[PDB]
Design a protein around this ligand. Structure first.
Ligand SMILES: NC(=O)c1ccc[n+]([C@@H]2O[C@H](COP(=O)([O-])OP(=O)(O)OC[C@H]3O[C@@H](n4cnc5c(N)ncnc54)[C@H](O)[C@@H]3O)[C@@H](O)[C@H]2O)c1
Ligand SMILES: NC(=O)c1ccc[n+]([C@@H]2O[C@H](COP(=O)([O-])OP(=O)(O)OC[C@H]3O[C@@H](n4cnc5c(N)ncnc54)[C@H](O)[C@@H]3O)[C@@H](O)[C@H]2O)c1
Ligand SMILES: Nc1nc2c(ncn2[C@@H]2O[C@H](COP(=O)(O)OP(=O)(O)OP(=O)(O)O)[C@@H](O)[C@H]2O)c(=O)[nH]1
Ligand SMILES: Nc1nc2c(ncn2[C@@H]2O[C@H](COP(=O)(O)OP(=O)(O)OP(=O)(O)O)[C@@H](O)[C@H]2O)c(=O)[nH]1
Ligand SMILES: Nc1nc2c(ncn2[C@@H]2O[C@H](COP(=O)(O)OP(=O)(O)OP(=O)(O)O)[C@@H](O)[C@H]2O)c(=O)[nH]1
Ligand SMILES: Nc1nc2c(ncn2[C@@H]2O[C@H](COP(=O)(O)OP(=O)(O)OP(=O)(O)O)[C@@H](O)[C@H]2O)c(=O)[nH]1
Ligand SMILES: Nc1ncnc2c1ncn2[C@@H]1O[C@H](COP(=O)(O)OP(=O)(O)OP(=O)(O)O)[C@@H](O)[C@H]1O
Ligand SMILES: Nc1ncnc2c1ncn2[C@@H]1O[C@H](COP(=O)(O)OP(=O)(O)OP(=O)(O)O)[C@@H](O)[C@H]1O
Ligand SMILES: O=c1[nH]cnc2c1ncn2[C@@H]1O[C@H](COP(=O)(O)O)[C@@H](O)[C@H]1O
Ligand SMILES: O=c1[nH]cnc2c1ncn2[C@@H]1O[C@H](COP(=O)(O)O)[C@@H](O)[C@H]1O
Lengths: 488, 14, 488, 14
């Protein structure tokens, strides 16, 4: 336990007061006894909601939709949803996202048997699934009759000759079911003893309460890190402004049932949103919120003792915002997420970083420096699940980048720009590179968990080192004619 | 489990 | 019906004696009385087999293999396969493209139940498909045991853990089959009203002769024009050389049973090619062959009297040819295809054209120029369905492209070039754009199918017109600062 | 029927 004390700790630099951003300083390694993928990524973003990977989308029109939302919560992160649309647009967005991976599912598609098959056609045109059961009446709490799947509606050249759904279906008696009052494990036992794909759940009174599908199991086998709630609903997030009409934005998605929600602002300290968090807590106390934005400790304390439980930090600091150039506020974002995190420890509120990420090493240093998660925008823009579609500029494949601080609200001043960046493909080959690189980072600094790196930072037994303007100039690639930039 | 997931225990020494 | 005769008809166009190409003449419009979807677009290439879509890959070594073949022929097209290397390799590729849709599946893979689950896993890892049958011996002509689809294997930690297959399959008494000597209609019908997923066929002796799955049905309606053969396999074609081991190159694929063959050449009008045609036709009266390279009627006539039934026209015409510059032969191909199609219509032999195609306009008026079908090669080069890879130079995703008479093949000359072009994406999002383009152009001309655009040129009812240098430098965009070119 | 499928009917007419 000698440990010769060379190095420099956190408060040993951040009271120097310089404008430290990420590529200004450096982490120092330590003594390990373990392997690379052995360290987990279990983190959290609320007082209660936790994530086994810290990578979360940004609420912006360039990035987030059910493309990014499904892609990220499916790979174990969490998406938010930007709000500059009609409230019903993000209502159908959420009714797209917290579906598609249900568990003991409630009130599916079901009808009367006196219908026709083009009802099923337009239903799957509005839905994309065709695993539908039938009852006697059409309500969910009805007497069960039968079930309809893809293989009974796939050949029909004699399409809709008043095709009543009694003679052409699966019958009643040739269907295995489950009695209600049943947990998941024996339901899985029933399904892979059935191998039929679907399994209704009724009572002893033959009254439908639930059904399950099979592809739940296939995605679960595909996607072990999965970001799932208790009710086997996929996690979903959304952005909300603070002009007063957003009450009618959040209420309808609240009965839709979004479970986290960010209150987005450039500078989130105002009387408006503190009145609004008081407006939401008495309405929705079980619901959990993420508060922002915040740059430093004073507005941090006033919005936490206002009653927020989660903290979105970082201003003027993205790849896009020129807000520091045009509003003269913000700060170097590394020192920001330092100091708000060591205030945030005093209440156990989680801190998620914002912008300024060039690369994997930046979210590595931000995680190490005490951010709870990090939400990012650019290198998880330009995916094939960012909305809109591509174009070219001198043949470079690229998709536009745009942030609401720019000139596209729908006499104004712009805080950001509109630009574009080349595509990097799906996340499914990309965010595993992210998580693998950062657990590689977490191992060769010397810790078994992100919780260990933060406690091992507040202990100060890791140490850092600031490096000069001519010291990252060789930290990158140099001293050669030409080279190539590939990551994986 | 979120409360100890940040650091788990220290929470003090100002 | 007053209808002035303003314009130029074809024979009074081309007998000016000028080397017209596509980029220096154009087509007049006509009368329209229907919509673009109300066109038919069925063409043909030989006296037997017809194609729903008049476009075909060119057999060059770095543009087409299995991917192009099954993908484009799956879209009602037809692919040809090059002859760059050893014949067993090409035999394997024509073998794997002869399946991917079959009739009654003769000789699939089948196993004996003393195998393990890991055996089926490693079979799938070099097949991709795992709806496996199982017999007593493991041979094809054997007695049935059971059936295993993908629903049976996907949930076991036990891959070999005493995983002899007998305790895990369905027992064959509740397994319906068909008796042999049966056609598809009632076969597929009792499949769908049986509704179980796969349907084997045995005899009275329970000997396996055939099996059919669901995948016929959704490949049928997902590709409603699909270029089926008589046994509803897809069609295929392959290229060959002329050095005396070409006989060994053709006989083993004749055992593989290709559907057509393209005689490649630098130039067709040889003793070699007519003598090998006479080597073919006595050996294979049932199999069909196309001819080339030939750009005038004299070489056309002494190839067609040999009994070739189709024709590849246009040398010194491709994106990659430089045989004008080094070898001083050929002609502008638009002047070729008129007069060789005018000669080829005398004998009912259709013709496929090559080279120089930029766009849907070139092939559109090209098949309107008298060609039956046209074999575009470069505008579908460098897709994701292409051989090779994406790579990068100067910051653009990119794929190389040679010409199959370069010096890069293996005391010689060179008349092919090697280069590269941009990616064009998935062909299933690309060739429907193409057929939409042809049908809008024919919609502009106003014929409900292509055969009367060829007759309507042969009637000369439509006209044509010259373009000059100012006309084509108008023809694209002009007088404009900066733009983008987005095809779709 | 490919002879019909190219032009049909006229089929040369010099
Ligand atoms: N680093 C960053 O995160 C960053 C950078 C640039 C821009 N932005 C984006 O800039 C967006 C602009 O939104 P905003 O921050 O201006 O909040 P806002 O658009 O909802 O309010 C507009 C302005 O009116 C005032 N305001 C706040 N609440 C109000 C209310 N109920 N009623 C009337 N006026 C109110 C504020 O001055 C605010 O600047 C933000 O959503 C933020 O996402 C963020
Ligand atoms: N636009 C085009 O399609 C085009 C034009 C020119 C050349 N090419 C390609 O260039 C490639 C190479 O040119 P190539 O002429 O050397 O190959 P080739 O197959 O075109 O002709 C073979 C060459 O060997 C000789 N030859 C002809 N028959 C022979 C036989 N039975 N046995 C031995 N030799 C024979 C001839 O000199 C001939 O040039 C060819 O694959 C040709 O297709 C294509
Ligand atoms: N039938 C049905 N499916 C739903 C519903 N909600 C979501 N799904 C989703 O539909 C997804 C895919 O459906 P499948 O399991 O593939 O069965 P299917 O709907 O018949 O679709 P096919 O694959 O064509 O057979 C499931 O993972 C479910 O998560 C619902 O309310 N009814
Ligand atoms: N198809 C499906 N099964 C799940 C899911 N979550 C849990 N299960 C099953 O629930 C079983 C019991 O574990 P639980 O405590 O209920 O939930 P869990 O900890 O998330 O389980 P895992 O998903 O396996 O990690 C697991 O073995 C899983 O097989 C899910 O999201 N989809
Ligand atoms: N499954 C299977 N497909 C084959 C076989 N031989 C050729 N195929 C080709 O593969 C196509 C379909 O493959 P799939 O059956 O969908 O692949 P799979 O994983 O086995 O799917 P399931 O059979 O439904 O379990 C067939 O239509 C044929 O074109 C075979 O022996 N088994
Ligand atoms: N569903 C299906 N039917 C086929 C297929 N091939 C032949 N048939 C049947 O063959 C019967 C006789 O007509 P054909 O001209 O020989 O084949 P087809 O009509 O082109 O086959 P389809 O693709 O179903 O239209 C048709 O009624 C078809 O139902 C196939 O691949 N799929
Ligand atoms: N309790 C059940 N009892 C009887 N059959 C069932 C039951 N559950 C599902 N099935 C049968 O399985 C059939 C189809 O389900 P299956 O998952 O095997 O195929 P699919 O959903 O139509 O297509 P895919 O498997 O590709 O998703 C249903 O139409 C139904 O006949
Ligand atoms: N004659 C038959 N008799 C009884 N059961 C059959 C018969 N044919 C197929 N099956 C049963 O129905 C199932 C059909 O499996 P299925 O075709 O749905 O697999 P799959 O989900 O489509 O696989 P994939 O997604 O890879 O295409 C078999 O596993 C088998 O249990
Ligand atoms: O409207 C905007 N204009 C510019 N930047 C924004 C805007 N809204 C949010 N941001 C932040 O800008 C960052 C995006 O840049 P990046 O994360 O470096 O890709 C994120 O931290 C966002 O939270
Ligand atoms: O190496 C070569 N020398 C001359 N012509 C070639 C060569 N390779 C391919 N071709 C021809 O060029 C055509 C391609 O047309 P493209 O689409 O203009 O590139 C092919 O169909 C061939 O007939």
């Amino acid at each position: 336990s000698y440990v010769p004390d060379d190095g420099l700790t956190a408060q040993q630099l951040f009271n120097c007061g310089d404008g430290l951003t990420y590529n200004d300083f450096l982490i120092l390694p330590g003594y390990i006894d373990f392997t690379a993928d052995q360290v987990d990524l279990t983190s959290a973003l609320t007082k209660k909601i936790t994530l086994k990977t810290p990578l979360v989308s940004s609420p912006m029109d360039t990035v987030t939709e059910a493309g990014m939302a499904i892609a990220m919560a499916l790979t174990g992160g969490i998406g938010f949803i930007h709000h500059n649309c009609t409230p019903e647009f993000q209502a159908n967005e959420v009714r797209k996202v917290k579906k598609y991976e249900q568990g003991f599912i409630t009130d599916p598609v079901v009808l009367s048997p006196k219908d026709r098959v083009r009802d099923v056609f337009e239903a799957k045109a509005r839905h994309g699934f065709c695993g539908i059961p039938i009852t006697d009446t059409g309500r969910m709490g009805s007497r069960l009759v039968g079930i309809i799947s893809s293989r009974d509606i796939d050949f029909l050249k004699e399409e809709e000759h008043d095709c009543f759904l009694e003679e052409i279906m699966t019958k009643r008696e040739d269907l295995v079911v489950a009695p209600a009052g049943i947990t998941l494990k024996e339901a899985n036992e029933i399904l892979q003893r059935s191998k039929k794909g679907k399994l209704p759940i009724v009572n002893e009174d033959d009254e439908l309460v639930a059904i399950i599908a099979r592809t739940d199991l296939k995605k679960n086998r595909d996607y072990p890190l999965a970001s799932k709630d208790a009710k086997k609903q996929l996690l979903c997030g959304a952005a909300i402004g603070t002009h007063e009409d957003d009450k009618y934005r959040l209420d309808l998605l609240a009965q839709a049932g979004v479970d986290v929600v960010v209150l987005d602002s450039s500078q989130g300290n105002s009387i408006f949103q503190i009145n609004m968090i008081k407006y939401i807590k008495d309405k929705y106390p079980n619901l959990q919120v993420i508060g922002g934005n915040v740059v430093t400790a004073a507005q941090a304390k006033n919005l936490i003792d206002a009653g927020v439980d989660a903290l979105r930090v970082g201003m003027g600091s993205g790849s896009i915002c020129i807000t520091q150039e045009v509003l003269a506020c913000g700060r170097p974002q590394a020192t920001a997420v330092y100091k708000v995190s060591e205030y945030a420890r005093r209440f156990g509120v989680p801190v998620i970083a914002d912008g300024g990420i060039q690369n994997v090493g930046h979210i590595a240093k931000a995680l190490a420096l005490g951010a709870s998660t990090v939400m990012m925008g650019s290198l998880l823009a330009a995916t094939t699940e960012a909305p809109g579609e591509y174009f070219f500029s001198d043949g470079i494949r690229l998709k536009k980048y745009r942030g609401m601080g720019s000139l596209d609200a729908m006499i104004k001043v712009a805080q950001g720009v509109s630009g574009a960046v080349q595509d990097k493909g799906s996340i499914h080959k990309f965010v595993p590179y992210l998580i693998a690189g950062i657990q590689h980072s977490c191992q060769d600094i010397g810790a078994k968990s992100l919780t260990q790196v933060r406690a091992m930072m507040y202990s100060g037994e890791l140490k850092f080192e600031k490096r000069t303007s001519s010291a990252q100039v060789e930290g990158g690639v140099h001293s050669l004619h030409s080279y190539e930039k590939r990551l994986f | 489990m979120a409360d100890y997931l940040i650091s788990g225990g220290t929470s003090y020494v100002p």
